[PDB]
Design a protein around this nucleic acid. Structure first.
Ligand SMILES: [Mg+2]
Ligand SMILES: [Mg+2]
Ligand SMILES: [Mg+2]
Ligand SMILES: [Mg+2]
Ligand SMILES: [Mg+2]
Ligand SMILES: [Mg+2]
Ligand SMILES: [Mg+2]
Ligand SMILES: [Mg+2]
Ligand SMILES: [Mg+2]
Ligand SMILES: [Mg+2]
Ligand SMILES: [Mg+2]
Ligand SMILES: [Mg+2]
Ligand SMILES: [Mg+2]
Ligand SMILES: [Mg+2]
Lengths: 184, 266, 98, 73, 196, 49, 293, 123, 125
RNA sequence: AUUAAAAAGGUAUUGUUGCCCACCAAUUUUUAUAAUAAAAAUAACGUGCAGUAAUUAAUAUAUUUAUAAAAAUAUAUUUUUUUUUUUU
RNA sequence: UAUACAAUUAUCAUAUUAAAUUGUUAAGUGUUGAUUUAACCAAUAAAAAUAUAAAUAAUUUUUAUUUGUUUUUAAACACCAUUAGGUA
């Protein structure tokens, strides 16, 4: 029978089944395409893919799509799950702020420590320890140091991990990325 | 009793009173250690950042001009408020003045049915990045819910301290040992030190203190990788058993055994 | 117009059309325009810096990415599953009667 | 039905202050000493003539954060 | 005196009438319990019932905060390891130990960095216990039923719009394409419940 | 803090006055990296002076 | 011991616990210590033979320079100097990053009366108050920041569209001519064997299956492509790549591996555009009912 | 320590009035005649001077006085009362306990429940 | 009262037409976003209070300094004279103004009346 | 030369070898007698295993189904256990 | 046998000052086939997005009006039965 595109049985391969829509070039997906990336010359498409997937996963879009596209759930269970999600979020936010309000204190104590180092060894000395080019006679030394800093600052492409999808038996959640039990 | 922000039972601060740096450091102060002291100056009255959302739900976002273009005919300005898929952000992620939300969902609707915006996807996604506050990991915004960035800067500054410490331990080391190139037999040596300390010991010049040393080094050339022919016993055809392998006794005192460990899948 | 020419040509090749260029107008001299050229090339330079470094050669990068994906695959395979995933229906029914 | 662990020993968050407030001890001790059968402790011998401040009220009884309750703090 | 006012000789000192009928509550709060451990309901650390609480739900994610041992965990050195990996993959004729030296330097520092972060985090656990945590004494805020009153306020509104009638009522879900499959004269969109 | 040069380097010219700061930067230039916690530590290093 | 596993080595008390620390290892050879000491000492003297700030400064003789500092010119100068440094510094200790930015800007800059409008004038201009605060660039605005199709794919009559669809228990790949004609059939994780009567369903839609399938498909895809091109007279004899658009569906494990099997073909296939078409359900017909709801 | 460091603006602590308040309350915390909480709330609620806040606007900006008078008085009281067998110990301990707390995050604020004796306590 | 929708309590000290706060059909309160400055979310807002504390300020008299000429020349703006003070001021409450009940609570959804918050659009001016 | 700690439910009450649920016989007693009346006491026999987050979580309404607890579906819901993107 | 509810906050069935109601959009063919499922069996598969303001407060609507059951499958999903169909 007619299935939607995100349906389980959507694109079937069988003797009866035949795919629907213009399937190439200007296609069935014409204005329905969620992402587009022009591949930068000499860039493997694996970085492209892992960037896309990290994006979708961190913003909880792949969560949503997996969730809704597998089973039906009544508007009550959907509400319960979404608002539960959002309230757990709220709680953990109010935890993060506490942690952060402490870590800014820690960072302060560190900077203070740095001040005490300053008036033990004198300011200029401390600056020397931190990579100040006081030994730079001419610009060529400067350009060596700054060439070093350039070769550091240039960012090698980050390969960001995407948690695998866990296929369980009757699939209570197809959002399952871990083996922990969940409240449905 | 609860503070509003994270529910703290106190009001946050670092210092309060005018005297505390003095009184804490008092012996140093009479001594006169504290004269050029920049630690008792810089941080003396230093207080915590304001970590607060002045807009918990932004009535500020967007600034006024933007509203003009939140209509159906500005695909770009629609796009700066969506995800890269075109969906809206949940309220507690990207908060918007309710006017903007109305105008925006209406806009995307209209634009879609007129063919001026795609049913999925954000066509302006890259162009719009200027308008979003992309936050560099190198700057620090005192207000973030990012717990990573905070600890990153903590790391950074602490390591900036460690650098100093290491610089000045290797310096004084270099001068204690370089004094020997300055004075060979000049002085600093006791007769009793000649008795006790001139013998080999673990602090002086031990042989090696650890198992698996390197003995018998030679210049011989590398061999061909995998010179060894596979054994006659097939490791491939054997199946690995973990849980039931040995016999165990359960320390479970009372109650039914947890159904998630065993008796569940997978 | 130049943004659309690729797809127009790809859909109906037989169709003949020209890339349409706006009528040009110059502010000041060719000097201020050459300075506009320096500005656009400089912005393309800060953006050429910021965009991606991508090392040097492609295949040498792809090898690394695929390697670390593999290592993550086999550090994953060592995680404990849940009891329910692991056991058959046999022992489920056994524990049920029990 | 799961509940936060220590709810058994949970303090009364409105009234747990009352017990400790200076006026209460002033009154109680006041009618204890009045009996003639109790030797007054010395703090009473003192605050007898310097009774504590009137209008300092807790935030528990008055639910106002903006009320500046104490002349001191 | 020699110890706490909330704890007498035989256990927690029983103030409310619940303690006198149920005096198991005085001497046993769990399997992390000791006798000095009464009245301090949280037990030691690394110990059973040592976890601090935030608005009643316990804090079991601490390491995940400072980014030690988490999936989202903070990584110190990336550029190095990538650089070195690139070196290994490119060619075998030239071998660069320069990269491996920059990297092993990086690691050598990383160790002390991590011990520092851990120490600072334990100080955070201490501070959080002193000045924030309620010690599991307040009602959970983190699940929707705890907020029932909030939702009630919304149901009430949709009722007063309906002439103060249908509480908890919602529009009948129609069909995937109810609007275009129905003939003139039948409702093509879901109405307010009172409007039925 | 006031009148405190925050960016000062060792190739900066020596300040004229005697302050813990000026003297410590000076000493860094003269002795190299020799630094002692207190005066009796210096008298320790010179041994009998 | 008995029907139970042996303890790990670290669970036994130390094997040498009864041997004193001076015995492990023995420091023998003490006889030689003194010898080498003398030796080294001797060598030091040898190394001198190869090879081989307390300038009294009187404070009275400086006086001329001090008198130079009593002049109000030099004090005007120290005033200007100290008033320029008195603005609040945000710098604190020396920073590498900011130094680098500073000097990079110095390299970039080395490579490099009319009546004041009063408050009343800006009282009368409503526009100006809105220009000062506006986000909108004033001047000629770049057109590439307007047009809809600026950031979007640009196709060609010769392009091949590769479909990688990752499903939950399955993965498959297909390829299509730009004009929509199907090239090769759909190679599927269950079509290639690789699926049934086997290890389990858990691993059926896994990464490595997607890889097996895609890498099996491309292998069979090249020759048929060269035949379909030989039919219209496009030889593509040598030194050519197929310009490919990879369209990926599904957010399932089998996706990762799939694209990897494209990336190792980079010497044959050239990917211009990577765009994923993944259906999103705003709402629609009911999905099949699961267990709980 | 609490009376010294935990109270913004406890008047001028050298004056014989407030000084006597503190003295009496101290002798009442020793010898167990009062709870610590009760004696603290007694101290901060004690009678000082009419229009107290508005005289406080003529000295303090944010209402935080200087802490020297507090510590000198608090040591004085322990000396004049016979609190310790050896005289110095009073001053030393009162000083030391403050110096250690100086390093703590939000050092001079306290949660009201844990600040003093209550049913549930800290370890 | 443990019944939901009865949580707002019995307050007499409000200005509404019932002493039972939870039968009042005018202002429905918001338990999640309210009560930063007022303490509990039940209690009346700073500007609507009909009962006043000892050490707390009472309402500002609205103006809508010239008239202090006889006073201390330095005396600044009197703390109780305000330019904008509205005893009738609608505070944004989600369950009233943004009501997500008839929806699945997805990001854009819920019905909104804009008559509450003053328009920050540039369209008006 | 391949390690463990910290969050959790009980209709039981020395506590799962714990309790309980309906039909299926006798009898007792009131009545507003619907396949075979209804309701209440009740300690047999025989089915099972419905419930105590309890072997596909429960609860309420709705509709269907039926040896018996009950089960299927449509909605609301926690007297069910939680897992937490402030524009990437 | 007679011999003193509450009226400041009490969850199952006696509602009541309220602004709604109406919108014609989307989606579909290339070709030789193991899709879905823990597992069975029937067997073309794609899809249906836009509205605020405004309506005045109370005093005789209680036989009135009102609280998710709905024509059209020659349109599907979904659900129920099991290849015959029901329902949607
Ligand atoms: Mg059919
Ligand atoms: Mg339960
Ligand atoms: Mg318990
Ligand atoms: Mg416990
Ligand atoms: Mg009868
Ligand atoms: Mg009967
Ligand atoms: Mg059962
Ligand atoms: Mg059941
Ligand atoms: Mg059950
Ligand atoms: Mg039920
Ligand atoms: Mg049955
Ligand atoms: Mg039922
Ligand atoms: Mg059910
Ligand atoms: Mg009734």
């Amino acid at each position: 029978g007619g299935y939607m595109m995100y349906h389980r049985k959507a694109m079937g391969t069988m003797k009866y089944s035949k795919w629907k829509g213009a399937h190439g070039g200007i296609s069935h997906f014409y204005g329905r395409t969620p992402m587009v990336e022009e591949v930068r010359p000499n860039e493997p498409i694996t970085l492209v893919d892992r960037r896309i997937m990290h994006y979708v996963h961190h913003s909880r879009l792949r969560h949503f799509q997996l969730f809704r596209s597998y089973q039906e759930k009544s508007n009550s269970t959907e509400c319960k799950l979404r608002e539960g999600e959002m309230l757990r979020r709220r709680w953990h936010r109010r935890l993060q702020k506490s942690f952060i309000a402490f870590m800014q204190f820690k960072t302060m104590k560190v900077l203070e420590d740095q001040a005490r180092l300053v008036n033990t060894y004198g300011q200029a000395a401390v600056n020397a320890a931190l990579g100040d080019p006081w030994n730079a006679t001419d610009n060529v030394a400067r350009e060596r140091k700054s060439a070093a800093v350039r070769r550091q600052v240039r960012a090698l492409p980050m390969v960001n991990v995407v948690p695998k999808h866990v296929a369980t038996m009757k699939q209570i959640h197809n959002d399952r990325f871990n083996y922990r039990w969940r409240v449905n | 009793r609860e503070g509003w922000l994270f529910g703290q039972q106190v009001q946050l601060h670092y210092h309060r009173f005018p005297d505390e740096q003095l009184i804490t450091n008092l012996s140093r102060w009479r001594t006169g250690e504290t004269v050029g002291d920049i630690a008792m100056q810089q941080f003396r009255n230093a207080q915590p950042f304001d970590i607060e959302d002045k807009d918990p739900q932004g009535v500020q976002r967007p600034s006024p001009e933007v509203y003009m273009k939140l209509n159906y005919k500005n695909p770009a300005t629609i796009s700066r408020f969506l995800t890269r898929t075109g969906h809206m952000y949940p309220a507690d992620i990207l908060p918007l003045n309710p006017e903007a939300v109305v105008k925006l969902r209406v806009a995307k609707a209209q634009a879609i049915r007129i063919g001026l915006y795609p049913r999925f996807g954000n066509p302006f996604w890259f162009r719009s990045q200027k308008f979003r506050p992309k936050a560099y990991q190198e700057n620090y915004d005192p207000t973030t819910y990012s717990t990573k960035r905070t600890v990153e800067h903590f790391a950074y500054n602490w390591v900036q301290t460690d650098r100093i410490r290491r610089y000045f331990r290797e310096l004084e080391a270099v001068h204690t040992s370089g004094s020997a190139s300055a004075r060979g037999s000049g002085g600093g040596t006791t007769a009793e030190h000649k008795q006790q300390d001139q013998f080999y010991s673990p602090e002086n010049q031990p042989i090696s203190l650890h198992r698996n040393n390197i003995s018998y080094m030679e210049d011989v050339g590398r061999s061909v990788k995998n010179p060894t022919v596979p054994g006659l016993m097939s490791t491939k055809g054997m199946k690995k058993k973990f849980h039931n392998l040995y016999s165990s006794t359960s320390t479970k005192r009372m109650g039914f055994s947890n159904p998630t460990l065993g008796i569940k899948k997978v | 117009p130049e943004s659309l020419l690729s797809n127009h040509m790809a859909e109906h090749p037989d169709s003949t059309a020209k890339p349409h260029e706006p009528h040009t107008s110059s502010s000041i001299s060719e000097a201020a325009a050459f300075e506009e050229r320096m500005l656009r090339a400089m912005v393309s330079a800060k953006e050429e810096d910021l965009k991606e470094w991508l090392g040097d050669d492609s295949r040498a990068l792809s090898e690394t990415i695929d390697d670390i994906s593999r290592e993550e695959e086999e550090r994953e395979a060592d995680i404990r599953v849940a009891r329910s995933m692991e056991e058959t229906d046999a022992e489920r029914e056994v524990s049920r009667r029990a | 039905y799961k509940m936060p662990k220590n709810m058994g020993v949970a303090p009364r968050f409105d009234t747990w202050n009352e017990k400790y407030e200076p006026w209460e001890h002033m009154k109680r001790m006041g009618r204890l000493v009045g009996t003639g059968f109790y030797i007054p402790p010395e703090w009473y011998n003192h605050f007898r003539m310097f009774p504590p401040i009137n209008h300092n009220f807790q935030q528990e009884k008055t639910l106002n954060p903006h009320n500046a309750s104490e002349p001191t703090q | 005196r020699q110890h706490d006012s909330g704890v007498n000789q035989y256990g927690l000192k029983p103030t409310n009438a619940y303690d006198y009928i149920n005096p198991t509550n005085l001497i046993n709060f769990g399997r992390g319990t000791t006798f000095d451990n009464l009245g301090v309901r949280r037990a030691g650390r690394g110990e059973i019932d040592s976890s601090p609480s935030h608005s009643g739900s316990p804090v079991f994610t601490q390491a995940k905060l400072i980014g030690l041992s988490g999936e989202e965990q903070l990584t110190m050195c990336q550029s190095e390891t990538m650089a070195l990996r690139l070196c290994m993959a490119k060619a075998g004729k030239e071998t660069c130990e320069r990269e491996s030296r920059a990297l092993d330097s990086c690691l050598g520092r990383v160790g002390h960095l991590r011990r520092a972060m851990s120490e600072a985090c334990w100080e955070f656990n201490d501070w959080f216990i002193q000045n924030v945590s309620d010690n599991h004494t307040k009602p959970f805020q983190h699940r929707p039923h705890d907020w029932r009153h909030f939702y009630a306020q919304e149901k009430l509104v949709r009722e007063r719009q309906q002439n103060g009638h249908a509480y908890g009522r919602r529009p009948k879900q129609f069909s995937f394409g109810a609007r275009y499959v129905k003939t003139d004269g039948y409702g093509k969109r879901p109405r307010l419940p009172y409007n039925k | 803090p006031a009148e405190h040069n925050t960016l000062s380097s060792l190739r900066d010219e020596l300040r004229l006055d005697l302050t813990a700061q000026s003297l410590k930067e000076a000493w860094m230039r003269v002795s190299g990296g020799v630094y002692f916690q207190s005066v009796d530590e210096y008298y320790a290093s010179v041994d009998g002076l | 011991r008995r029907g139970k596993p042996r303890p790990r080595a670290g669970m036994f008390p130390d094997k040498y616990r009864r041997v004193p620390m001076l015995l492990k290892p023995q420091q023998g050879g003490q006889q030689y210590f003194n010898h080498f000491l003398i030796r080294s000492t001797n060598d030091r003297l040898t190394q001198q033979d190869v090879d081989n700030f307390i300038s009294p400064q009187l404070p009275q003789m400086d006086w001329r320079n001090m008198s130079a500092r009593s002049s109000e010119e030099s004090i005007r100068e120290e005033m200007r100097q100290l008033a320029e440094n008195d603005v609040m510094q945000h710098q604190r200790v020396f920073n590498e990053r900011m130094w680098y930015e500073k000097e990079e800007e110095h390299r970039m800059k080395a490579r490099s009366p009319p009546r004041v409008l009063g408050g009343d004038y800006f009282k009368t201009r409503f526009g100006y108050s809105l220009v000062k605060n506006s986000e909108m660039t004033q001047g000629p605005v770049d057109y590439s920041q307007l047009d809809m199709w600026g950031e979007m794919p640009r196709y060609t009559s010769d392009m091949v569209f590769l479909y990688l669809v990752s499903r939950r228990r399955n993965t498959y790949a297909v390829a299509y001519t730009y004009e929509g004609k199907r090239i090769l059939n759909t190679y599927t994780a269950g079509n290639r064997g690789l699926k049934g009567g086997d290890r389990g369903f858990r691993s059926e839609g896994s990464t490595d299956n997607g890889h097996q399938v895609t890498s099996m498909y491309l292998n069979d895809l090249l020759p048929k492509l060269r035949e379909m091109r030989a039919s219209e007279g496009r030889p593509m004899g040598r030194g050519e790549k197929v310009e490919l658009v990879v369209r990926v569906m599904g957010f399932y494990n089998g996706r990762q591996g799939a694209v990897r099997a494209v990336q190792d073909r980079a010497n044959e296939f050239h990917v211009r555009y990577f765009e994923d078409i993944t259906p999103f359900p705003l709402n629609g017909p009911k999905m099949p009912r699961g267990v709980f709801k | 320590c609490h009376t010294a460091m935990s109270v913004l603006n406890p008047g001028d602590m050298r004056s014989r009035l407030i000084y006597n308040h503190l003295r009496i309350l101290a002798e009442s915390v020793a010898s167990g005649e009062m709870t610590q909480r009760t004696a603290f709330r007694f101290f901060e609620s004690a009678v000082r001077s009419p229009a107290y806040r508005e005289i406080a606007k003529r000295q303090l900006e944010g209402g935080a006085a200087t802490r020297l008078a507090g510590i000198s008085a608090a040591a004085d009281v322990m000396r004049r009362m016979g609190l310790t067998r050896r005289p110095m110990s009073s001053y030393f301990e009162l000083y030391q306990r403050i110096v250690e707390r100086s390093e703590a995050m939000t050092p001079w604020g306290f949660p009201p429940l844990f600040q003093f004796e209550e049913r549930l306590s800290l370890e | 009262a443990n019944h939901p929708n009865r949580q707002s309590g019995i307050q007499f000290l409000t200005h509404y037409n019932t002493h039972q706060r939870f039968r009042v059909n005018k202002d429905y309160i918001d338990y999640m976003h309210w009560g930063k400055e007022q303490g509990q979310a039940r209690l009346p807002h700073r500007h609507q209070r009909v009962a006043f504390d000892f050490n707390d300020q009472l309402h500002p008299t609205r103006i809508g300094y010239a008239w202090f000429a006889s006073q201390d020349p330095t005396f600044g703006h009197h703390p109780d004279l305000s330019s904008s003070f509205d005893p009738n001021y609608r505070v944004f409450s989600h369950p009233e103004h943004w009501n997500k009940m008839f929806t699945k609570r997805r990001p854009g959804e819920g019905d909104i009346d804009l008559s509450v918050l003053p328009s920050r659009s540039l369209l008006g001016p």
